[PDB]
Design a protein around this ligand. Structure first.
Ligand SMILES: [K+]
Ligand SMILES: [K+]
Ligand SMILES: [K+]
Ligand SMILES: [K+]
Ligand SMILES: [K+]
Ligand SMILES: [K+]
Lengths: 462, 463, 463, 462
């Protein structure tokens, strides 16, 4: 590892056009000083591989403001108006790739794996191609995404994704010892860890340099072999994107969603109703919440003194963890998710089809496509029954872009609870008292079986 | 995580015929108590996915001795005569898979990836198929390995390997906290870590159970989500397979090999000459030695009282590590190796071809040799005696022995010469042992070679 | 042999899902009446082993049109849009197998040989696996071909291919005597002959039934032992797929290709330039042209009134044969080819590599191209325009198109140069089109090449 | 094709040590003139690939007398005392290879196939190796055969055999036209046909040269491309090795064996009882007899005027064929046999095991190992029940060299008829009247089931 006292020195040789991997999930674990250094070098036309686009004036957004990025390869680019403007104007190219796929393609890039298969994105536009990566000033499409090759293994369909390697990686880390060994703090690890292994030259900025021997050998997150250039970041603003401190239809969904929790369950909860539902878990029940940016054991929002820029949830809110929590990188998080280790994945949806196709993302798909990619994880959708104008949200076929095909196992609305089966379709198993099966018929766009043991819709006791 | 006080209770439901992942590299990090529990349950016909076969009376060898294994899926199975015996007799099935491929297939299996590509094994018997996985009693081949599918990416060839998942995994770990979070000690991590994610039911035995909060959250090697059953092992023998404590032709190779080292270099040294050469590294030079069983920063053999069963090198010798060393799992180790992060890989060879094909492994298995030379980014340097007994060529047009890799050697160091090897142009004699002539080399080499315009007498490290 | 007066009676017991071998090369020697009988029985989901797919409305194309075929195992399936349509739509499965391998696998299937080795397909997608045999409606790959196992014999690589056997074979023959002995006419023999031995129940339709004793015993092509069911075909359309009756860059290649011919030579000429070159053979020179569909002694295209549906060349063109010609079956033809008995094989190429890899076939299938260059004993001469549109290199370090063969080309003839090709040393420019310079060739060739010390202006046949 | 007027001219360049393929089955279709020419050139140390060793003073035996052969690769070398003497004395090397395997290895050699699998020889010394190929003068072994690799396919075991290619082939043919196209007459085709394709230089001698155009193109047995050198043989002796012109225990076996015949059956009959049994086939029944030297449709022994050196059966007897007979080469004959196209193969045996192993060959195995190699062909053994001294011939395990393993389906003796099953063993289905099941018990060396429908042993009506 080569140590630098000046960040510009550490990155001055990045060529125009370089593919640069930039760590960070939201504003968590971003290499703010290395990004500050690129503003000074003025290198341009970069293809930035960055999970997110920071915010308008921070993180990757600073490089978008200065127009130093030709293309971004990211999974979620919301919360950044300059980004949106450039994209629509045809000034910026954008390849949206599922978050877990982005993590794994980066990991493959550092592991000598040119390509691998993942179900994430199967049946969606990731597979189908056709998304505008780049527009012409006239508003037409200049570059459309390529469809992905898909192959069946063990009766399931998987898309072939290729490794992502960078010319450079700009990595934010916590500490580096004098040998160049590096560790990451809390959830700031995310993509920084795998990105450190996937570029020809990795540049890491750390908050502190410690003596060789400060780390237990077993606990070095990134061995020095991956750290080519190391600089102690000069300034850390610790920006927090969203400071989060500790109707009846919605309340009803929350209260029935709260009943999906089981003792010992591992769950991943999308923001909104699913997350609110966790507030009703019995202190008697032990439920472990997984966060896809690399956390297992999420706790409630922090009391003001617990607020930590390094600890946010997938919705980018400041959060806390419970005793016995663990942190891990983004590739490891999605290995955990894709491998079906989470028992329950509960999320909101705009539409769900008869056989469980889900439309809930189209800013980018973030980790939603990965979260529903495994048949081993029970996917529970919580959403209001019908859309504005009473248009069906549950129907034969989604009309909105799919997040996944035949991946929903249960739908919870304020009116009903449907179990969903990829081959047989819907089964009404709970019914809000006061409504009748025919009321459901009228608000649902496809047929459904009625369970012989249909009960009034339950509501958690709390 | 469910805690058990009895190991048999933790594994009694394993079915006959189950595929069981068993952690451990050699005797390092083996789940000796869970294995002991399987001897009691008597479950049989297991397909054991285990990097190695332990030794005759320990680790997986115990289950082979009791005949509870139908098939082993391993990368290296030497040091076991009952294994050898059962294999040749047609009583045991064996699929040899490159060590790094095994680690990655297991990882894939826990990560939802059904298959991936790797250059490891391309152009070898792994790709080619035809190795006997199983013999019949009369010596006929009952099952031959399947060839692997090939695909080209970015101008190179890779083979398609599929995930490995087990019904159960028997994992050895260091400590578990009360929530089921687990950590591994030193090099005992190896395959235990990835195997914990790749089975329907993971059973972990640990040396000690500690309070929730004993681990820093960032430093939990295996989050509790992957630990289904946990037991504190009742007995730990701390078996050490090889207790390693601190001619001229060979010495010459060693001394020229020592000159391949450069300050700041990351190197992986095979046992024998390569490793011996590291003893001549200048205390002025900083060289980081990587061990494929998951270590970066290997040090010299320990004094006797420093020996640690949890710390061994790839040759299964007890070792030490230097300040700033790190440990990591087998899949990570081979990601590091396959990704080309090691600058120099120096190993022994039986044969090397004109364009750099290497034969240096063949039934004991290829271990990590095929992975070690799988990347074009790592410089591969072979150190071997020039010619075989009877002066048969070892360096020639084509290897006649099973390949470890195709066009992967960049340099050959023998007691007579040093050849740089290029996949397109072939051999270039760049150093010549003084007293020998270019014609002497011609006579001991089985293919043509260019003679560098800057050919020098063969160098020898100063030490 | 059991005689039938009704074709439907002869095939009514074929089960849905049966594997059925169907004779014929193009529309030559196809069992049109048995196929017509299958349209009436309606049997479905057949795995049809048929060299070709007939044409849209004839031969196997009729069964594709009625959707009675689940999978085709063929070597060449061009000239059929319903086939193409069903394949891409995921309605039809297709395993492309080299023509000669198909013939030999079928023969093996009737000879009790479960598997054999052939160099045909080594280093290509046949060995490598991964071709889509079947797509799903959304375009995903439902079934990918399996790679083939490799083995080395006498220093060369071969792949292991397995026998093909059918439940039934639908065979077209010329005459059967009353005992069930059968003969084939001209080139209509092709696959019909070997397919008669490789199915549990063989059904043969013939044009005429003659008295026992009409055949000389030595001249029965298929002994009655292989003929289980026999029917005199009710109707024979004598369909002819291609009625063939007797620039300067291209002309230059042709005229230099014509100089590859030698008196007494056995040659196999691919359609296009190679075949055109044969028109310049001196009536003084005797050259015997072999056709892989089973002919030795091809002659010029016939006058219109000499056209015979039973006599076509490999490009499916109607032809004639010269005095002393012979006909033989497809397995025999490829034994002849694979055995290296043809002295010169001249074909077109899309790309040729420095060491002689050839890309000249790729989904229509590789036909006999992979077999044609499979032998080191046959000189393989490629005739192609030097560079592709946009001047992209066609001759280069490595082909970027699917290989037909590895290191199998011995010479390249373009409108600018003639290169001898050596598998170990590469290219040697031996002739140069006058007016061009060695540097001009450098600019249009994607790899280095030696310049012969005896380089001459490119020759042109006198005619 | 190059035509020669002098045979010596056609073969003078054969090197000492050359591997030479010599056509012929017994004395049928031997290249007598080319062999005469080798006597004059004196080339030595040849490895002669020849199905048989001719007889003492003819065919290959002439080359053995002159000591010009170092090694023979043959399937049957009986009827030649000089051969036997040299072999035992250690002067001649001998590799016995099953006839059908020899044919197929030669064919593979001309077809570009380096190796193939065949069940022929599985479970026998062909697989096991250990046969002396060469003795030392002291009577010990100098060279022992190598075991063959065996691999399972579709649940069956097959041995890997490698191609045989020659430096030269000496081929006897009937006619050649002026272009070099060649045809073979009757059963003289045998190995000459495949040998013409498997050597670097093929030399063919023919009885007559005819005009181009004499052969129908479809009926050229060997296209000119395979005929490198052609000579019209100067002399043809038409030697006939065995001139064959048209007790009660043995008679009983014959009469019960005659009942194995069925209308429309294809059968291959070994010499002795099986062949004698065919004399009792009803003129009402149509049975087609296959001869492994390349004939289908064998008829009775010839009346003196029908005697033809070109037409002999597998026992090398002069024979005739019936209307509608066909001739074919040795590789094609064994493809027919190995592929299981013959319905019934009836042969004599020295021993048969409980599960159907057969010992009936140890001169060489000839085609016996191939004849029983297919599970599709019913193998019926006809033999006297017990050996001299009443030793068991039917027992648990044969003690004599195996011809095949689990390949016998029925055993016919003068006392009993046993069906044989590879998994269940023996089932006594017929019993010679006057004998009891216990009498069979006493004469049989293993247990056997007694059919519930056991009948007195049948005897053909004729
Ligand atoms: K699911
Ligand atoms: K390398
Ligand atoms: K390589
Ligand atoms: K060639
Ligand atoms: K080749
Ligand atoms: K049988």
């Amino acid at each position: 590892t080569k140590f630098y006292t000046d960040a510009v020195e550490a990155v001055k040789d990045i060529p125009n056009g370089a593919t640069v991997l930039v760590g960070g999930f939201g504003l968590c674990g971003i290499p703010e000083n290395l990004i500050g250094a690129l503003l000074k070098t003025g290198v341009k036309e970069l293809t930035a591989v960055s999970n997110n686009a920071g915010v308008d004036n921070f993180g990757l957004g600073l490089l978008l403001q200065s127009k130093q990025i030709k293309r971004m390869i990211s999974s979620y680019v919301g919360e950044n108006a300059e980004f949106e403007r450039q994209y629509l104007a045809g000034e910026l190219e954008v390849e949206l790739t599922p978050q877990g796929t982005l993590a794994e393609r980066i990991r493959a890039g550092g592991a000598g794996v040119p390509a691998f298969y993942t179900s994430t994105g199967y049946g969606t536009l990731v597979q189908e191609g056709g998304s505008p990566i780049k527009y012409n000033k006239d508003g037409s499409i200049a570059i459309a995404s390529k469809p992905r090759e898909v192959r069946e293994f063990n009766g399931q369909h998987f898309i072939l994704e290729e490794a992502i390697r960078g010319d450079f990686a700009l990595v934010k880390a916590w500490k580096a010892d004098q040998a160049g060994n590096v560790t990451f703090r809390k959830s700031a690890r995310n993509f920084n860890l795998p990105m450190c292994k996937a570029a020809e030259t990795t540049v890491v900025e750390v908050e502190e340099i410690v003596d060789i021997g400060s780390f237990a050998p077993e606990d070095i997150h990134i061995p020095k072999i991956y750290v080519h250039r190391l600089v102690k970041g000069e300034k850390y603003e610790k920006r927090i994107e969203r400071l989060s401190v500790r109707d009846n239809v919605r309340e009803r969904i929350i209260k029935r969603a709260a009943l999906e929790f089981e003792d010992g369950m591992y769950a991943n909860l999308g923001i909104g109703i699913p997350l609110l539902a966790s507030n009703f878990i019995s202190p008697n029940m032990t439920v472990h919440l997984q966060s896809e940016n690399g956390i297992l054991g999420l706790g409630p929002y922090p009391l003001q003194n617990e607020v930590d820029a390094d600890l946010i949830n997938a919705g980018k809110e400041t959060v806390t963890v419970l005793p016995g929590a663990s942190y891990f990188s983004s590739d490891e998080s999605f290995a955990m998710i894709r491998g079906g280790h989470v028992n329950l994945t509960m999320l909101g949806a705009m539409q769900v089809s008869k056989y469980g196709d889900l439309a809930n993302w189209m800013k980018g798909m973030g980790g939603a496509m990965d979260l529903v990619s495994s048949a081993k994880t029970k996917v529970v959708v919580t959403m209001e029954h019908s859309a504005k104008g009473n248009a069906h949200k549950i129907m034969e076929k989604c009309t909105l872009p799919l997040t996944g095909k035949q991946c929903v196992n249960r739908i919870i609305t304020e009116k009903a609870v449907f179990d969903v089966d990829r081959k047989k379709g819907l089964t009404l198993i709970e019914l809000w008292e006061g409504l009748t099966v025919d009321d459901i018929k009228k608000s649902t766009g496809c047929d459904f079986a009625v369970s012989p043991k249909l009960i009034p819709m339950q509501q958690v006791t709390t």
